[PDB]
Amino acid sequence: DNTTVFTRILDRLLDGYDNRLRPGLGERVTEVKTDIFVTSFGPVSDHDMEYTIDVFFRQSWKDERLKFKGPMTVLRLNNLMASKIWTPDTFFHNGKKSVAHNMTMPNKLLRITEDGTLLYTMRLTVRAECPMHLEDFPMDAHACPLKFGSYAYTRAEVVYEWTREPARSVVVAEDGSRLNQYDLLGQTVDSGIVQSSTGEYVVMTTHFHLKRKIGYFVIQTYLPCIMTVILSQVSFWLNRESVPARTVFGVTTVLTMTTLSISARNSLPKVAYATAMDWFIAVCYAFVFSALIEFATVNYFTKSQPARAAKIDRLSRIAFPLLFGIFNLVYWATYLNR
Amino acid sequence: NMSFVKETVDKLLKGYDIRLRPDFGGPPVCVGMNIDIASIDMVSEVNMDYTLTMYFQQYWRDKRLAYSGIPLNLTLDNRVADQLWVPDTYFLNDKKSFVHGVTVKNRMIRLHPDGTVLYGLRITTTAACMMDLRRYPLDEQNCTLEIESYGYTTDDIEFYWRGGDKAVTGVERIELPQFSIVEHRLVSRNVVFATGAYPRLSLSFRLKRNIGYFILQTYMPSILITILSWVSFWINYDASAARVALGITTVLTMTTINTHLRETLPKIPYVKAIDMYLMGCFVFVFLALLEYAFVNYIFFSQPARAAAIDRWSRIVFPFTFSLFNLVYWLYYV
């Protein structure tokens, strides 16, 4: 008996209700209040220039055609009811492929208050586009955006607002960071307007600010390249009479740089300009190359001009270590101070 | 007021036969297209295709959907599209495509008082384009997008671009990591299959690859090793342990470059313009080592003649490598 009372209320609301028409058609602009709870911020892909984010996307609006009076004030209904009524067609402008989870049931909620206000939330895994500028790789920072708005309703019909103050409307869970090489510093919440070829639409935007962690590249690429360059300059201390020693020493370090330069290329995304690591490796490739060219000059003058042969070898013990020191002062101050 | 609009929409959908195209048996129904490209990415040489995301709009006039007394453009819920007639437009070279469906199926239905219908879908497709990579990486491609009607012939449906050359926008905002869009072209024509003549619309871009990426990792590492092998000519010819150690290691170093570069580069199993260059550099380091062995065989019998080979090898090898580059670079550029 008591249960059937709510059945009659649900039947009455849908009787003479058309879901093809937004509330207040031809009279007023529908206001949809939106806020987001980011459950977890997924991995960021450098090669695909994308990222993943899981949100509790919440929307709210007012419909005068669903007003009712009864024993209860809030109808904690099921998602089976949602398809019967009108819901905003919110989509993500820069989304690549998003999933609306439905295990074990459609992850959607619908609550109707007595005055007609609706709350409609859902769980999503959005994969968005984040164009990047890798001119400072690996010491780079990015601001990945997330833009959503209506698809078919222009700003003369549907306008979007944040539920609370914009800063405190996109809440990120404390244990919601799946980043392993980035560092989510913070996010900013803003609003805008776009002009397509059909009309003016309202766009809600959120930017997440990241900053890559360079600890992995120091122990894997920067240090081995420094030691290999340092190792090649050791050849300036072996006496000139040991021709097989310095030639084997000189040429293997070129092979070591090639082996190191190949592996470091795998982590680099495919771009068409010079990154900050490409400048360092290319410069470190020049020092191991010039060390071997230097020995040939020293060996050529040996046994015919001994005085000059030592002079070249004596100066090179200073110039080569000094220049590499100057390079590591200009380089590490240019990129670390941006 | 609002209840009157429900009556108007109910009147239109009542008796509307979805199985009949507009003007069935009369003049063909003209459909106009707009494309607002959102992004282009994943231009892959391994699979010879590309991924294209766009806003695809179609316009046609239906007399059955005319209404009066409502001075508005009724943007209806997108699920009313299942109760209307829409063209069976499809992409001929489409390998995999889908209409985005978050948070709802990305689709727009807008009606006008005179019966005109605007129908927009947000589609992400993966169209195929054959690539002539024989000049890789100094190559130029032409990847297209073919739009055609499937079940209706030129007697029933017509296609055209809406606005002319302005029908496709958003190309200027596209930037690719490895390519640069040079020009896009719109073509309208007919294709005659075995079941009739079908209207066709074509959208074709022309991509020219960026060149500065391969200089750092592909051509410069191979050139520097080749120059290193020439150091062997300024070493005394009796230093057998030194010239051989330098001579053979460069071959190993050049081999190490090719095998790992072969993996990084896309698997394109036929001869390109980069394989010819790399093999060109592998011969020079090969001949440098083979040149010493001739010197080492005769440096004891004829020391004076052996020194002559060294002096000339310091000139012939640099001259020929620069000559090889001159023929190569002009041939492919």
């Epitope: 913070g186 900013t188 002009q195 930017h207 600010h209 | 930037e175």
Partner: nanobody
Framework: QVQLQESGGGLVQAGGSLRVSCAAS????????MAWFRQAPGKEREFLAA???????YYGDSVRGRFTISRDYAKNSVDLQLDGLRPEDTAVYYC?????????????????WGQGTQVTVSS
């Protein structure tokens, strides 16, 4: 070197259109955010409008509904359409481009800047 050259400006009679343009050279700003900033004499530098790669348009509170920003991606230029100019608008307008790190409304997030364009409104 990247140069942000501006144009436009002048004197107006307490209203009327005055389109102020900008021009960029040396680097393509297709993937960057190009914005317009205003610096009243002695007060501060103030954000007016911006437009990123997706044609999303942001404005300020005191300039919404009056100033319109447009970008010509082919010519690497950004224009600001000034309408209904008020005497309080007398200031120096700047052209900026950046990646929008730590917010696109902050003047410290743009690595490039124009040379300014004086616009004076007579009451």
């Amino acid at each position: 070197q990247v140069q942000l050259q501006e144009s436009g400006g002048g004197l107006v009679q307490a209203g009327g259109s005055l389109r102020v343009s900008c021009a960029a050279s040396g680097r393509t700003f297709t993937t960057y955010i190009m914005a317009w900033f205003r610096q009243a004499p002695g007060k501060e530098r103030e954000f007016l409008a911006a437009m990123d790669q997706g044609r999303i348009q942001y404005y300020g509170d005191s300039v919404r509904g009056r100033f319109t920003i447009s970008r010509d991606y082919a010519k690497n230029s950004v224009d600001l359409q000034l309408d209904g100019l008020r005497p309080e608008d007398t200031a120096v307008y700047y052209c900026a481009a950046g990646a929008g790190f730590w917010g696109l409304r902050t003047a410290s997030s743009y690595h490039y800047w124009g040379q300014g364009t004086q616009v004076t409104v007579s009451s």
